[PDB]
Amino acid sequence: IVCHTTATSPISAVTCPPGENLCYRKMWCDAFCSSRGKVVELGCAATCPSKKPYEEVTCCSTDKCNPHPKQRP
Amino acid sequence: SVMEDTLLSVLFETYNPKVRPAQTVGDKVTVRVGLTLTNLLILNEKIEEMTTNVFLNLAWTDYRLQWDPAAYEGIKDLRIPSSDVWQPDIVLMNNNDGSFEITLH
Amino acid sequence: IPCLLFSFLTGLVFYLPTDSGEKMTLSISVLLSLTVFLLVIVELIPSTSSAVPLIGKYMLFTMIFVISSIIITVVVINTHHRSPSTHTMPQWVRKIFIDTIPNVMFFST
Amino acid sequence: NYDANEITMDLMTDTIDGKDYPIEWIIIDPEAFTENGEWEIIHKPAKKNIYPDKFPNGTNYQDVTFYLIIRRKPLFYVINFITPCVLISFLASLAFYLPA
Amino acid sequence: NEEERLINDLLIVNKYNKHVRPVKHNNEVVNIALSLTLSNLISLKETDETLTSNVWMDHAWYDHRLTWNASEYSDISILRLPPELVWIPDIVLQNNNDGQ
Numbered sequence: 122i123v124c125h126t127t128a129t130s131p132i133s134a135v136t137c138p139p140g141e142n143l144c145y146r147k148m149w150c151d152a153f154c155s156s157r158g159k160v161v162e163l164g165c166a167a168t169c170p171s172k173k174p175y176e177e178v179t180c181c182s183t184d185k186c187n188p189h190p191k192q193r194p
Numbered sequence: 195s196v197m198e199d200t201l202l203s204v205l206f207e208t209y210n211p212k213v214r215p216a217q218t219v220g221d222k223v224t225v226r227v228g229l230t231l232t233n234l235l236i237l238n239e240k241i242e243e244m245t246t247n248v249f250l251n252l253a254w255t256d257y258r259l260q261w262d263p264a265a266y267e268g269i270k271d272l273r274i275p276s277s278d279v280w281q282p283d284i285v286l287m288n289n290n291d292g293s294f295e296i297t298l299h
Numbered sequence: 300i301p302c303l304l305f306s307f308l309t310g311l312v313f314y315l316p317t318d319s320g321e322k323m324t325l326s327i328s329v330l331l332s333l334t335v336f337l338l339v340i341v342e343l344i345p346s347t348s349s350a351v352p353l354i355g356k357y358m359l360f361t362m363i364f365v366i367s368s369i370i371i372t373v374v375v376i377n378t379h380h381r382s383p384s385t386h387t388m389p390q391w392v393r394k395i396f397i398d399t400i401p402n403v404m405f406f407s408t
Numbered sequence: 409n410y411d412a413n414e415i416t417m418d419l420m421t422d423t424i425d426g427k428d429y430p431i432e433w434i435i436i437d438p439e440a441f442t443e444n445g446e447w448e449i450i451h452k453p454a455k456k457n458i459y460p461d462k463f464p465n466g467t468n469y470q471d472v473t474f475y476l477i478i479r480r481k482p483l484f485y486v487i488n489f490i491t492p493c494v495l496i497s498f499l500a501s502l503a504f505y506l507p508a
Numbered sequence: 509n510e511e512e513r514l515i516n517d518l519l520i521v522n523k524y525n526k527h528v529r530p531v532k533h534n535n536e537v538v539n540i541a542l543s544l545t546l547s548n549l550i551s552l553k554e555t556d557e558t559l560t561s562n563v564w565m566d567h568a569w570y571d572h573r574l575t576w577n578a579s580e581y582s583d584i585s586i587l588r589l590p591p592e593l594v595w596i597p598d599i600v601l602q603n604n605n606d607g608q
């Protein structure tokens with residue numbers, strides 16, 4: 122699978138290892154949600170990551186579902 | 195505002211804030227001293243001290259800071275940093291610390 | 300360490316016979332010493348409410364231990380001055396504490 | 409330093425769904441906030457306050473106030489003040505079972 | 509560096525005064541939007557009756573004098589400036605205990 126990840130600077134399209142066949146996208150408002158917007162974590166996960174009252178998780182099994190909201194999959 | 199800059203440049207050409215305004219040698223400046231209490235914080239009796247948050251309300255007349263508002267787009271009042279005008283050294287004499295002067299300028 | 304001493308003394312009052320009017324003296328003075336030690340604990344220990352520390356659990360334990368010792372001490376003292384004129388010994392009292400237990404008490408003498 | 413006719417203190421606005429909304433609360437990062445060990449935050453409002461008894465010329469007609477309604481965590485006292493005293497007073501009561 | 513030319517054309521050339529409100533006429537108001545972020549709540553000493561807080565004030569205002577056509581310069585979309593060069597609204601905590 123190929124996902125977008127914020128584990129690289131800049132954001133890059135990478136090939137997840139074995140077991141991680143899902144592309145995810147966490148987004149939550151931190152102290153700077155007003156100026157900068159929501160945080161954006163991207164990457165690959167084996168099991169879909171857990172969600173919290175403030176987090177907003179998008180979860181796929183397809184290639185490049187998880188672009189930064191200012192980009193297209 | 196361009197009229198405010200012009201007016202400030204005019205007023206403060208030869209204005210010295212080290213000098214007490216006496217349009218005529220021998221005059222006295224009239225200072226009105228009021229006090230606004232915002233909170234009586236503490237009256238520690240072990241050290242005989244009294245802590246307050248107050249606004250002083252000072253008023254005086256500086257003959258040098260005059261102008262016709264008709265010449266400056268109707269500017270009838272200016273807000274000017276305190277360090278730029280002459281101000282009297284109105285202080286708390288009966289302090290227990292060594293802080294005579296005010297905190298917020 | 301002071302808490303250890305106080306807990307040991309708490310357990311210790313139970314070898315003191317009621318004939319000496321000092322069981323309550325001892326237990327209650329252990330309790331007073333532990334209250335003064337709570338007083339110093341409040342000065343040497345964090346005053347936070349996020350969790351009970353280990354010392355706090357131990358302190359509460361020794362305090363409940365002392366207090367239970369005092370309560371059972373009172374019960375013992377009353378069982379001592381339990382006159383026949385007003386109370387009659389039942390069957391279980393002279394069956395357990397007089398015919399069974401004294402026979403399985405080897406450290407007693 | 410300025411009167412209400414010279415500057416206007418307002419609350420910051422934000423957007424979610426193409427609509428502007430004011431930030432009527434203190435902002436607190438939900439991950440990077442380490443809760444204090446004695447106080448819990450229940451409410452955290454923010455208000456722009458106008459005092460119409462006063463005049464706009466003047467620095468007392470304006471106020472942006474941020475309120476913290478915080479609740480105490482009652483554990484240090486419950487473990488070190490209330491429980492011991494309660495049980496010791498119970499001892500006093502039980503003193504009536506002690507023969508003279 | 510394009511910033512060196514710009515920060516000159518704004519502050520020195522155009523004779524920017526930091527002791528003057530950013531208004532064309534002295535009858536308009538400068539709207540200052542301020543929020544508050546609580547980084548951490550340190551204390552609420554009940555004896556001294558004082559809340560201690562680490563907060564981030566977030567001001568926002570328009571200064572028409574700090575304007576520029578980004579294409580006239582290079583495409584400079586943003587600028588950082590020390591507040592000792594630009595006009596700042598001294599928005600203060602009035603209900604403070606210390607002299608801070």
Ligand SMILES: *[C@@H]1O[C@H](CO)[C@@H](O[C@@H]2O[C@H](CO)[C@@H](O[C@@H]3O[C@H](CO[C@H]4O[C@H](CO[C@H]5O[C@H](CO)[C@@H](O)[C@H](O)[C@@H]5O[C@H]5O[C@H](CO)[C@@H](O)[C@H](O)[C@@H]5O)[C@@H](O)[C@H](O[C@H]5O[C@H](CO)[C@@H](O)[C@H](O)[C@@H]5O)[C@@H]4O)[C@@H](O)[C@H](O[C@H]4O[C@H](CO)[C@@H](O)[C@H](O)[C@@H]4O[C@H]4O[C@H](CO)[C@@H](O)[C@H](O)[C@@H]4O[C@H]4O[C@H](CO)[C@@H](O)[C@H](O)[C@@H]4O)[C@@H]3O)[C@H](O)[C@H]2NC(C)=O)[C@H](O)[C@H]1NC(C)=O
Binds near residue numbers: 162
């Ligand atoms: C006490 O409290 C503390 C705070 O409360 C707490 O701190 C936390 O500790 C944990 C564990 O120590 C931290 O978790 C780690 O965080 C790291 C940092 O993540 C940042 O950076 C990476 C990029 O990393 C590259 O670049 C950085 C910086 O330049 C280097 O330092 C790295 O070595 C690495 O460099 C390589 O790659 C570069 C190119 O990118 C090359 O140039 C270079 O030459 C090297 O090859 C980003 O990806 C991160 O972004 C992600 O996270 C942020 C938020 O953190 C998100 O915002 C963002 O969107 C991304 O999601 C971040 O920016 C991580 O690197 C580290 O990751 C490893 O571990 C996790 C799980 O633990 C794995 O998922 C991950 O794959 C990594 O595993 C690799 O690395 C580990 C060792 O790090 C190996 O064990 C493992 O086998 C695997 O190995 C491979 O890669 C290694 C390179 O990393 C390589 O060396 C190996 O040889 C092997 O090939 C992990 O997530 C956490 O950040 C701390 N938090 C804070 C706030 O500090 C502490 O734990 C507490 N302690 C106790 C006892 O309680």
Ligand SMILES: *[C@@H]1O[C@H](CO)[C@@H](O)[C@H](O)[C@H]1NC(C)=O
Binds near residue numbers: 463465
């Ligand atoms: C402020 O406005 C009030 C009400 O119009 C007026 O009485 C007062 O004189 C004004 N103060 C100044 C300094 O102009």
Ligand SMILES: *[C@@H]1O[C@H](CO)[C@@H](O)[C@H](O)[C@H]1NC(C)=O
Binds near residue numbers: 577578579580
């Ligand atoms: C900015 O400068 C470019 C270059 O001359 C010009 O084409 C453009 O119209 C300018 N924009 C504005 C808003 O003046």
